Amino acid sequence: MFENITAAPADPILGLADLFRADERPGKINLGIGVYKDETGKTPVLTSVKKAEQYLLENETTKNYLGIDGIPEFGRCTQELLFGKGSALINDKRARTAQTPGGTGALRVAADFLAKNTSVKRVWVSNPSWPNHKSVFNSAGLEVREYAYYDAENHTLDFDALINSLNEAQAGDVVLFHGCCHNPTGIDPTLEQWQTLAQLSVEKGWLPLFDFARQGFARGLEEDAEGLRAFAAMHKELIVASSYSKNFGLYNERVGACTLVAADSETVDRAFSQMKAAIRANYSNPPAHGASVVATILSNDALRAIWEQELTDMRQRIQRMRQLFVNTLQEKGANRDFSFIIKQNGMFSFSGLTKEQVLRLREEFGVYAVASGAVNVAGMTPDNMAPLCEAIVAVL
Amino acid sequence: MFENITAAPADPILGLADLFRADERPGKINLGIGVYKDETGKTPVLTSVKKAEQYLLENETTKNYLGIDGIPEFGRCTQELLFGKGSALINDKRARTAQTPGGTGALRVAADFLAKNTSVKRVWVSNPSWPNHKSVFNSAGLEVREYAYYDAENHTLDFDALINSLNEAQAGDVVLFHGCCHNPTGIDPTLEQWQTLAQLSVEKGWLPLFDFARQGFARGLEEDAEGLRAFAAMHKELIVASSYSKNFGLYNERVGACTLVAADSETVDRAFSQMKAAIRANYSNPPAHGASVVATILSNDALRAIWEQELTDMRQRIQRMRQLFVNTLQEKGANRDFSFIIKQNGMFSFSGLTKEQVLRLREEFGVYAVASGAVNVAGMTPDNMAPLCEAIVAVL
Ligand SMILES: Cc1ncc(COP(=O)(O)O)c(CN[C@@H](CC(=O)O)C(=O)O)c1O
Ligand SMILES: Cc1ncc(COP(=O)(O)O)c(CN[C@@H](CC(=O)O)C(=O)O)c1O
């Protein structure tokens, strides 16, 4: 049965990582992966988390299965975060949330759901996007088209190009949006743009799918959600996939959610049932540990305060590295302006580098960027900035 | 898009559990879900687990992603449990293991893998079997056929009928086998039958897929792997989906493994890469918590000794309930002769009840069995026995 199986192509992200290890060179930097890093170059366990964990150690009396959708408080807490405390969506019992194994698991779950219960055939993602988007949708047997997004020339959002590709999209098509902190560009729309896209969407019959993997990393928890919120204000239906991997430092625990929104309660309920059937035939029910830690923290005022502060620290550290990066770029001879960087959000920055430049950076230099050409500002440290900056100049 | 979605039917297992949850009548017995219960009628957290979770709490320094296949130690440990310390499959490096979200997760990954990289079109499952089997397979696009297994008349394994039905199975078809403790029948094959089953499988070209969800609940860790080991001794290829939900009481942490076995290390490696690609488009990487717990316990002689003892206690409590159940039934007045019970293994027992009897047994007195007429022996206590049997006799 397996003699003729072909090797699978290496994973664009994961693949690069494997090689980072094998590169046995001393002073090699590693800016190519969307995980948070501290001033010391480590990815620690949050203090709020370690606390929520003592608590769970002390208080759990059973490990009996959660329900297919997971921890209820988990669900309410997420919807609050997404939509806001006094949301009508919430008030009208118009949304349902399923706890899933990470942001990926949600996407997948949303994928299977749509493929088997709807007339959906195509999902539109941006160019560029997180490479894994395509594989997940394609796995559900859905088509993935692409929309223009980035302006290679001006290092900004190509609004017209974007609105222009979107016209090849049919009513009933799924359009995927990065909630904030676009991967891998770091370029997000403005509130005004989001509002324009929102009106367009309803005018056109698109089904919005938001990918929210870094809420709290652009401007702050609430700000970062104004986009989603503008859509939710006019859409009857919508889907949201979120992840708590970056914001809670819970990567390996697989904490995310899939929120389904319908015109009304009777509808989401009917629909949510199919979504649950989908989960049942996939992984059955979710992993408790990380979601539990999340609920505990979001529910306890003290823990939650420590957490938001930890989040703020992470976010500020990033903002520090962008400025420091363009600065050192300048003081290092670079004679290209890297100031657009400063206007970018999140961990990712589309530096401007070329496919070859990237190869070079890593071959000669030991500096590992993303295949796509983006760098993870979060892997930069006051210590590694110089060396890293010399190398980039050396290839411009 | 959601307007006409049709509500999903209730799950045969999960659906009853909920039904049982919305009735607070007194002496309400719950025998229809396959979770272990103690004499107190609870599902406790093992002490070995509690011990391991502290260690983790004390040692963990990061929640950074695990690789697609999870924890290495976890894989080796699983393999040794499965095949034996000195297995050739192990020495020849002929097997690769992916850490998955529970046994359902493993099954689903095996399914996607098979569907996308192979000529498999059908999977043969026993009649009856755990109802979720048909669902995971169908979700992956595979078709499922059923082979006879159970002798309603004699409360045994219909070996002839089984073999006789399997004959309709072609070369390249997947035949699903429950490693031990058949669900929901409790009827397992003898070693001699396994051997017969192994040899016929080789010559007919079936691809064996073993579902191993309760290793340790029949006779013991090793003893339980006997059947798996006979096949392994003469197949070039095979797939193993295992669960640590029951045996470690880690139900909600989602701890399982998918083991792939090929003719050699090069083949296994190439197939495995296709497996990892399947995972990556599903949930991406697995939940660390449960698995670390397993790995830690399995690696430590001390924790290990403690863990095996707790398993032994669980197993012996079930054996106790089997005997007490036939005795009480006996006394309480039953007409039928339920000694066959004694010969069954694990948590379940096909009592031999009809569809109506189960309906009645639950509308009438609040005894909740599985639609199939199976009854979870592990949800029986010395307290609830009498009332239980009283209800049962009332319906024969
Ligand atoms: C935009 C985006 N969406 C969804 C996800 C999936 O998140 P979960 O880890 O919660 O599943 C990621 C993670 N992308 C990271 C890491 C990775 O892809 O493995 C990145 O390096 O871009 C992401 O960047
Ligand atoms: C035969 C069998 N295989 C796989 C699984 C899945 O195990 P995981 O929980 O590790 O995914 C179960 C669990 N079956 C239980 C519980 C359930 O079906 O949800 C049962 O009631 O039979 C099972 O009985």
PDB file of C-alpha atoms in Angstrom, chain A residues 1-3 5-9 11 13-14 35 43-45 49-50 53-54 56-57 60-66 68 101 104-105 108 112-114 116-120 130 132 135-136 139 172 207 237-239 245-246 249-254 260-262 267 270-271 273-274 277 280-289, chain B residues 1-3 5-8 11 13-14 35 43-45 49-50 53-54 56-57 60-66 68 101 104-105 108 112-114 116-120 130 132 135-136 139 172 207 237-239 245-246 249-254 260-262 267 270-271 273-274 277-278 280-289:
ATOM      1  CA  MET A   1       0.000   0.000   0.000  1.00  0.00           C
ATOM      2  CA  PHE A   2       2.688   2.548   0.774  1.00  0.00           C
ATOM      3  CA  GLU A   3       5.470   1.662  -1.655  1.00  0.00           C
ATOM      4  CA  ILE A   5       3.742   7.176  -1.882  1.00  0.00           C
ATOM      5  CA  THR A   6       5.521  10.397  -2.765  1.00  0.00           C
ATOM      6  CA  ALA A   7       7.394  12.505  -0.254  1.00  0.00           C
ATOM      7  CA  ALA A   8       5.685  15.547   0.821  1.00  0.00           C
ATOM      8  CA  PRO A   9       7.151  18.884   0.000  1.00  0.00           C
ATOM      9  CA  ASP A  11       6.465  22.993   5.037  1.00  0.00           C
ATOM     10  CA  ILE A  13       7.408  27.556   7.784  1.00  0.00           C
ATOM     11  CA  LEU A  14       8.074  24.366   9.642  1.00  0.00           C
ATOM     12  CA  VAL A  35       6.224  33.231  17.824  1.00  0.00           C
ATOM     13  CA  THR A  43       9.544  32.237  24.846  1.00  0.00           C
ATOM     14  CA  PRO A  44       8.505  31.964  28.447  1.00  0.00           C
ATOM     15  CA  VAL A  45       5.421  30.893  30.275  1.00  0.00           C
ATOM     16  CA  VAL A  49      -0.528  31.293  33.215  1.00  0.00           C
ATOM     17  CA  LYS A  50       1.786  29.681  35.779  1.00  0.00           C
ATOM     18  CA  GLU A  53      -1.939  26.369  36.508  1.00  0.00           C
ATOM     19  CA  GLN A  54      -1.261  26.006  40.288  1.00  0.00           C
ATOM     20  CA  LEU A  56      -5.955  24.014  38.291  1.00  0.00           C
ATOM     21  CA  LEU A  57      -3.487  21.615  39.867  1.00  0.00           C
ATOM     22  CA  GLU A  60      -9.280  19.739  39.360  1.00  0.00           C
ATOM     23  CA  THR A  61     -11.054  16.620  40.582  1.00  0.00           C
ATOM     24  CA  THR A  62     -11.730  15.030  37.218  1.00  0.00           C
ATOM     25  CA  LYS A  63     -10.495  14.883  33.695  1.00  0.00           C
ATOM     26  CA  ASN A  64     -13.781  13.743  32.301  1.00  0.00           C
ATOM     27  CA  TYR A  65     -14.552  14.767  28.772  1.00  0.00           C
ATOM     28  CA  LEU A  66     -15.619  18.263  28.029  1.00  0.00           C
ATOM     29  CA  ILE A  68     -17.989  18.846  21.981  1.00  0.00           C
ATOM     30  CA  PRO A 101      -7.365  22.826  19.016  1.00  0.00           C
ATOM     31  CA  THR A 104      -5.623  26.151  12.867  1.00  0.00           C
ATOM     32  CA  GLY A 105      -8.176  23.720  14.300  1.00  0.00           C
ATOM     33  CA  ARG A 108     -10.267  23.496   9.658  1.00  0.00           C
ATOM     34  CA  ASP A 112     -15.396  21.133   7.027  1.00  0.00           C
ATOM     35  CA  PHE A 113     -18.505  22.836   8.219  1.00  0.00           C
ATOM     36  CA  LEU A 114     -18.909  24.924   5.068  1.00  0.00           C
ATOM     37  CA  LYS A 116     -20.567  19.778   3.853  1.00  0.00           C
ATOM     38  CA  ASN A 117     -23.423  22.083   4.874  1.00  0.00           C
ATOM     39  CA  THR A 118     -23.275  24.922   2.401  1.00  0.00           C
ATOM     40  CA  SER A 119     -22.985  25.743  -1.264  1.00  0.00           C
ATOM     41  CA  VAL A 120     -19.510  27.256  -0.681  1.00  0.00           C
ATOM     42  CA  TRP A 130      -0.038  32.662   5.914  1.00  0.00           C
ATOM     43  CA  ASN A 132      -1.166  27.267   5.859  1.00  0.00           C
ATOM     44  CA  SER A 135      -3.599  23.802   2.769  1.00  0.00           C
ATOM     45  CA  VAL A 136      -6.361  23.862   5.329  1.00  0.00           C
ATOM     46  CA  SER A 139      -8.042  19.890   2.678  1.00  0.00           C
ATOM     47  CA  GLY A 172     -21.815  33.163  -1.696  1.00  0.00           C
ATOM     48  CA  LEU A 207     -19.408  35.393   3.645  1.00  0.00           C
ATOM     49  CA  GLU A 237     -23.701  35.792   9.060  1.00  0.00           C
ATOM     50  CA  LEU A 238     -20.035  35.549   9.761  1.00  0.00           C
ATOM     51  CA  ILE A 239     -17.371  33.210  10.997  1.00  0.00           C
ATOM     52  CA  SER A 245      -1.461  30.899  21.158  1.00  0.00           C
ATOM     53  CA  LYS A 246       0.268  34.224  20.815  1.00  0.00           C
ATOM     54  CA  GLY A 249       1.871  32.237  25.280  1.00  0.00           C
ATOM     55  CA  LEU A 250      -0.080  28.946  25.120  1.00  0.00           C
ATOM     56  CA  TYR A 251       1.256  27.725  21.692  1.00  0.00           C
ATOM     57  CA  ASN A 252       1.676  24.014  22.468  1.00  0.00           C
ATOM     58  CA  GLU A 253      -1.587  23.764  24.354  1.00  0.00           C
ATOM     59  CA  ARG A 254      -3.782  24.317  21.295  1.00  0.00           C
ATOM     60  CA  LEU A 260     -20.394  31.074  14.188  1.00  0.00           C
ATOM     61  CA  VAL A 261     -22.788  34.038  13.743  1.00  0.00           C
ATOM     62  CA  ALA A 262     -26.286  33.828  12.265  1.00  0.00           C
ATOM     63  CA  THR A 267     -30.469  29.555  12.959  1.00  0.00           C
ATOM     64  CA  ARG A 270     -29.353  24.595  13.821  1.00  0.00           C
ATOM     65  CA  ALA A 271     -26.094  25.478  12.150  1.00  0.00           C
ATOM     66  CA  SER A 273     -25.254  21.402  15.414  1.00  0.00           C
ATOM     67  CA  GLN A 274     -23.662  20.603  12.063  1.00  0.00           C
ATOM     68  CA  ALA A 277     -21.061  16.949  14.119  1.00  0.00           C
ATOM     69  CA  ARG A 280     -17.136  14.939  16.515  1.00  0.00           C
ATOM     70  CA  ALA A 281     -15.828  13.160  13.425  1.00  0.00           C
ATOM     71  CA  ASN A 282     -12.505  14.950  13.641  1.00  0.00           C
ATOM     72  CA  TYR A 283     -11.100  15.138  17.190  1.00  0.00           C
ATOM     73  CA  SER A 284     -14.295  14.506  19.261  1.00  0.00           C
ATOM     74  CA  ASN A 285     -13.940  17.127  21.974  1.00  0.00           C
ATOM     75  CA  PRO A 286     -11.214  19.619  22.828  1.00  0.00           C
ATOM     76  CA  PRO A 287      -8.128  19.567  25.039  1.00  0.00           C
ATOM     77  CA  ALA A 288      -9.014  21.104  28.431  1.00  0.00           C
ATOM     78  CA  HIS A 289      -5.689  22.347  29.854  1.00  0.00           C
TER      79      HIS A 289
ATOM     80  CA  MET B   1     -25.908  30.838   3.731  1.00  0.00           C
ATOM     81  CA  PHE B   2     -27.145  29.331   6.890  1.00  0.00           C
ATOM     82  CA  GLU B   3     -30.875  29.750   6.394  1.00  0.00           C
ATOM     83  CA  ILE B   5     -29.065  24.250   7.173  1.00  0.00           C
ATOM     84  CA  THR B   6     -30.583  21.093   8.530  1.00  0.00           C
ATOM     85  CA  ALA B   7     -30.113  20.285  12.219  1.00  0.00           C
ATOM     86  CA  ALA B   8     -27.784  17.449  12.917  1.00  0.00           C
ATOM     87  CA  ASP B  11     -25.047  11.509  18.501  1.00  0.00           C
ATOM     88  CA  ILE B  13     -23.518   8.309  22.686  1.00  0.00           C
ATOM     89  CA  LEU B  14     -23.150  11.942  23.493  1.00  0.00           C
ATOM     90  CA  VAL B  35     -15.787   6.374  31.002  1.00  0.00           C
ATOM     91  CA  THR B  43     -13.975   9.775  37.562  1.00  0.00           C
ATOM     92  CA  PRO B  44     -10.969  10.813  39.428  1.00  0.00           C
ATOM     93  CA  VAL B  45      -7.644  12.137  38.481  1.00  0.00           C
ATOM     94  CA  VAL B  49      -1.066  12.080  36.874  1.00  0.00           C
ATOM     95  CA  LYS B  50      -1.378  14.595  39.744  1.00  0.00           C
ATOM     96  CA  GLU B  53       1.355  17.628  36.641  1.00  0.00           C
ATOM     97  CA  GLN B  54       3.301  19.149  39.473  1.00  0.00           C
ATOM     98  CA  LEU B  56       5.504  19.876  34.786  1.00  0.00           C
ATOM     99  CA  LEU B  57       4.383  22.962  36.699  1.00  0.00           C
ATOM    100  CA  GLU B  60       8.156  23.837  32.207  1.00  0.00           C
ATOM    101  CA  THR B  61       9.939  26.863  30.898  1.00  0.00           C
ATOM    102  CA  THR B  62       8.040  27.390  27.672  1.00  0.00           C
ATOM    103  CA  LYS B  63       4.800  26.660  25.868  1.00  0.00           C
ATOM    104  CA  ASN B  64       6.436  26.848  22.447  1.00  0.00           C
ATOM    105  CA  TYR B  65       5.072  24.630  19.729  1.00  0.00           C
ATOM    106  CA  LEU B  66       5.710  20.956  19.609  1.00  0.00           C
ATOM    107  CA  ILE B  68       3.832  18.178  14.052  1.00  0.00           C
ATOM    108  CA  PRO B 101      -5.651  14.687  20.022  1.00  0.00           C
ATOM    109  CA  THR B 104     -10.501   9.808  17.636  1.00  0.00           C
ATOM    110  CA  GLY B 105      -7.827  12.180  16.456  1.00  0.00           C
ATOM    111  CA  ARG B 108      -9.071  10.778  11.708  1.00  0.00           C
ATOM    112  CA  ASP B 112      -7.238  11.533   5.857  1.00  0.00           C
ATOM    113  CA  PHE B 113      -3.871  10.042   5.094  1.00  0.00           C
ATOM    114  CA  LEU B 114      -5.319   6.937   3.560  1.00  0.00           C
ATOM    115  CA  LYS B 116      -5.353  11.319   0.042  1.00  0.00           C
ATOM    116  CA  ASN B 117      -2.340   9.137  -0.579  1.00  0.00           C
ATOM    117  CA  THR B 118      -3.635   5.776  -1.251  1.00  0.00           C
ATOM    118  CA  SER B 119      -5.991   3.606  -3.245  1.00  0.00           C
ATOM    119  CA  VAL B 120      -8.091   2.758  -0.177  1.00  0.00           C
ATOM    120  CA  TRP B 130     -18.361   2.160  18.342  1.00  0.00           C
ATOM    121  CA  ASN B 132     -18.183   7.130  15.853  1.00  0.00           C
ATOM    122  CA  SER B 135     -18.466   8.938  11.111  1.00  0.00           C
ATOM    123  CA  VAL B 136     -14.763   9.573  11.108  1.00  0.00           C
ATOM    124  CA  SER B 139     -15.899  12.245   6.903  1.00  0.00           C
ATOM    125  CA  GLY B 172      -6.224  -3.152  -0.568  1.00  0.00           C
ATOM    126  CA  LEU B 207      -4.570  -3.493   5.381  1.00  0.00           C
ATOM    127  CA  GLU B 237       2.220  -2.541   6.862  1.00  0.00           C
ATOM    128  CA  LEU B 238      -0.381  -1.585   9.410  1.00  0.00           C
ATOM    129  CA  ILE B 239      -1.844   1.355  11.225  1.00  0.00           C
ATOM    130  CA  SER B 245      -8.050   8.478  27.626  1.00  0.00           C
ATOM    131  CA  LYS B 246      -9.124   5.503  29.713  1.00  0.00           C
ATOM    132  CA  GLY B 249      -7.856   8.954  33.029  1.00  0.00           C
ATOM    133  CA  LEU B 250      -6.832  11.766  30.725  1.00  0.00           C
ATOM    134  CA  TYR B 251     -10.094  11.919  28.723  1.00  0.00           C
ATOM    135  CA  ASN B 252     -10.159  15.685  28.324  1.00  0.00           C
ATOM    136  CA  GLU B 253      -6.546  16.316  27.666  1.00  0.00           C
ATOM    137  CA  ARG B 254      -6.826  14.554  24.206  1.00  0.00           C
ATOM    138  CA  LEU B 260       2.348   3.872  10.993  1.00  0.00           C
ATOM    139  CA  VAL B 261       4.200   0.709  10.089  1.00  0.00           C
ATOM    140  CA  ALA B 262       5.877   0.065   6.709  1.00  0.00           C
ATOM    141  CA  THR B 267       9.177   3.688   3.126  1.00  0.00           C
ATOM    142  CA  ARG B 270       8.158   8.850   3.120  1.00  0.00           C
ATOM    143  CA  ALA B 271       4.633   7.840   4.045  1.00  0.00           C
ATOM    144  CA  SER B 273       5.723  12.885   5.795  1.00  0.00           C
ATOM    145  CA  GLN B 274       2.376  12.606   4.050  1.00  0.00           C
ATOM    146  CA  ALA B 277       1.127  17.064   6.100  1.00  0.00           C
ATOM    147  CA  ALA B 278      -2.393  15.814   6.909  1.00  0.00           C
ATOM    148  CA  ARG B 280      -0.666  20.296   9.657  1.00  0.00           C
ATOM    149  CA  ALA B 281      -3.786  21.047   7.586  1.00  0.00           C
ATOM    150  CA  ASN B 282      -5.960  19.811  10.428  1.00  0.00           C
ATOM    151  CA  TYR B 283      -4.869  20.928  13.851  1.00  0.00           C
ATOM    152  CA  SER B 284      -1.256  21.719  13.037  1.00  0.00           C
ATOM    153  CA  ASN B 285       0.508  20.376  16.126  1.00  0.00           C
ATOM    154  CA  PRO B 286      -0.713  18.463  19.202  1.00  0.00           C
ATOM    155  CA  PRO B 287      -1.636  19.568  22.785  1.00  0.00           C
ATOM    156  CA  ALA B 288       1.357  19.193  25.060  1.00  0.00           C
ATOM    157  CA  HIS B 289      -0.226  18.768  28.526  1.00  0.00           C
TER     158      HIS B 289
END
